[PDB]
Amino acid sequence: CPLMVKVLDAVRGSPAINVAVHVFRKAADDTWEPFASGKTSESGELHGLTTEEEFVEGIYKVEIDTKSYWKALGISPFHEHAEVVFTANDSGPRRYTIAALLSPYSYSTTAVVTN
Amino acid sequence: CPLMVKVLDAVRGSPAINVAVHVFRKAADDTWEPFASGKTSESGELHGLTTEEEFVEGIYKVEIDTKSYWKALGISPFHEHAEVVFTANDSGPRRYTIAALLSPYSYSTTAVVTNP
Amino acid sequence: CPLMVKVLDAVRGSPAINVAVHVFRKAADDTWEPFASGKTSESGELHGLTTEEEFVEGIYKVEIDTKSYWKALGISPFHEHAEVVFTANDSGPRRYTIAALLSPYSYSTTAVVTNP
Amino acid sequence: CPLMVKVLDAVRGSPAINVAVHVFRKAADDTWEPFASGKTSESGELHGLTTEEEFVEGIYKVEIDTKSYWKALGISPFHEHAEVVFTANDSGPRRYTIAALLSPYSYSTTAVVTN
Numbered sequence: 001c002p003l004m005v006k007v008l009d010a011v012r013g014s015p016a017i018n019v020a021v022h023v024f025r026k027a028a029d030d031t032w033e034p035f036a037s038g039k040t041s042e043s044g045e046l047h048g049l050t051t052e053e054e055f056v057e058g059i060y061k062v063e064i065d066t067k068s069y070w071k072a073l074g075i076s077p078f079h080e081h082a083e084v085v086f087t088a089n090d091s092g093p094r095r096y097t098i099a100a101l102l103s104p105y106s107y108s109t110t111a112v113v114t115n
Numbered sequence: 116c117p118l119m120v121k122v123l124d125a126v127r128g129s130p131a132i133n134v135a136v137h138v139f140r141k142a143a144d145d146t147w148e149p150f151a152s153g154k155t156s157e158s159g160e161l162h163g164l165t166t167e168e169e170f171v172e173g174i175y176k177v178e179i180d181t182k183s184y185w186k187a188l189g190i191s192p193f194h195e196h197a198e199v200v201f202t203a204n205d206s207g208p209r210r211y212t213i214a215a216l217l218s219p220y221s222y223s224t225t226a227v228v229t230n231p
Numbered sequence: 232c233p234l235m236v237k238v239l240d241a242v243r244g245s246p247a248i249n250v251a252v253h254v255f256r257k258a259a260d261d262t263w264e265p266f267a268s269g270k271t272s273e274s275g276e277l278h279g280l281t282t283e284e285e286f287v288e289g290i291y292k293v294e295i296d297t298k299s300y301w302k303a304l305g306i307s308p309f310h311e312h313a314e315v316v317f318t319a320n321d322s323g324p325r326r327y328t329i330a331a332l333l334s335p336y337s338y339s340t341t342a343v344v345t346n347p
Numbered sequence: 348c349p350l351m352v353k354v355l356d357a358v359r360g361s362p363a364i365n366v367a368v369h370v371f372r373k374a375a376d377d378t379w380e381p382f383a384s385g386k387t388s389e390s391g392e393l394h395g396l397t398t399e400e401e402f403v404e405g406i407y408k409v410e411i412d413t414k415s416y417w418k419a420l421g422i423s424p425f426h427e428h429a430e431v432v433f434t435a436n437d438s439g440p441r442r443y444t445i446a447a448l449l450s451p452y453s454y455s456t457t458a459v460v461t462n
């Protein structure tokens with residue numbers, strides 16, 4: 001599992017459950033090609049997006065559908081979505097975790113890249 | 116000034132100076148049209164991107180060029196850029212400050228929205 | 232103004248107004264001595280805590296009373312307060328801005344340190 | 348395991364390994380009594396701090412020794428330590444995770460409180 005997404009809710013102090021996440025890979029013509037997607041689990045995690053063989057070097061975009069998440073909780077949010085855009089690089093450690101901490105008018109994101 | 120961007124550097128404990136910022140607005144055909152651009156000053160602020168007349172309702176994307184920023188500091192960061200995507204002015208004109216706090220493998224961003 | 236505190240509310244997208252702040256300094260005997268206090272203004276800023284003469288070298292603790300802030304908004308938050316503990320002025324006088332971004336179960340804090 | 352601490356490094360994009368963490372419980376006379384301590388593991392986690400029976404309602408302080416962490420990496424940091432102060436409350440969910448994301452002049456912290 002070379003790419004995992006973890007989403008936390010800073011208002012409720014909980015995992016962010018049932019958040020839609022869409023991953024795209026930048027094509028040669030600079031468009032964003034769908035690559036993988038899913039919804040976070042009860043633990044705020046989304047595993048199984050891709051495989052080692054498919055996850056080649058390149059630029060990827062992880063879009064987290066924060067607007068729908070907040071609206072489902074009856075809360076009015078600022079952003080359309082959170083976006084995390086990065087290069088996958090084979091010289092680095094194997095496993096990428098993209099974490100995001102969500103508030104209605106703010107978000108944090110970090111990368112935890114490990115062997 | 117209805118759209119302002121402020122950027123801090125969490126490694127140095129300073130404003131993030133000379134950070135390039137590109138703003139786009141979603142057009143009728145659903146593509147991202149260039150809207151305004153600039154770079155942060157010695158205070159880490161970027162003023163003068165747009166005017167109240169030109170900053171109409173729409174979905175805007177503020178791209179903060181964090182990789183170019185870090186690369187000028189000889190650092191090799193994780194993200195390409197920070198993207199901040201939001202609907203603006205859909206309840207009338209507001210003033211928006213997009214703030215960002217940068218680290219090489221992480222960033223935070225928050226919006227301060229005020230009603231003149 | 233050599234010590235300034237700025238607080239934002241990540242739920243409302245606004246300055247965090249009326250946030251109480253208490254500053255302490257570690258004394259010779261190793262206890263936390265009260266040093267200054269105040270509350271954030273309508274801009275979320277707190278100025279005038281101290282003076283360059285009184286803000287000598289030492290270890291300071293800036294307590295931001297996030298629970299009292301949230302409780303005045305009828306919200307029940309997680310933390311008691313945010314504590315920011317740092318050595319100041321140990322390479323000569325500097326100006327410090329302690330910034331904080333608040334959510335009910337989370338906060339961020341960063342320092343901007345400048346040399347006059 | 349009612350109390351767990353997770354620490355991440357935003358400069359390296361990694362768990363923060365071998366960070367000392369000290370937990371205190373506020374005594375009746377308003378002093379901070381040592382309660383538990385340890386060092387984060389290779390995954391940036393510190394488990395086994397306390398037990399359900401010992402972790403009673405009250406105010407706790409988790410001090411994360413960030414200054415020593417940065418200095419061991421040859422980096423000059425701002426804070427003496429990061430401090431997370433909160434009330435444990437039985438009406439809430441059972442398990443408290445205190446997460447912190449560290450930079451030299453900044454840190455983030457959130458609580459993930461679950462069943």
Ligand SMILES: O=C(O)[C@H]1O[C@@H](Oc2ccc(/C=C/c3cc(O)cc(O)c3)cc2)[C@H](O)[C@@H](O)[C@@H]1O
Nearest residue numbers: 099100101108109110112353446448455456457
């Ligand atoms: O990062 C790891 O190695 C593992 O960490 C496990 O637990 C947590 C628990 C809490 C966090 C918190 C992340 C976070 C991220 C931010 O952008 C800001 C912040 O204050 C905190 C991240 C991971 C996750 O449950 C695992 O799936 C993950 O693999």
Ligand SMILES: O=C(O)[C@H]1O[C@@H](Oc2ccc(/C=C/c3cc(O)cc(O)c3)cc2)[C@H](O)[C@@H](O)[C@@H]1O
Nearest residue numbers: 158214215216223224225237330332339340341
């Ligand atoms: O840069 C300037 O010229 C002035 O900017 C003023 O306003 C802001 C407004 C917002 C921010 C935001 C800080 C912040 C801090 C975080 O921990 C995370 C995040 O996403 C943003 C910091 C300073 C400050 O209040 C002034 O002190 C400062 O001088």
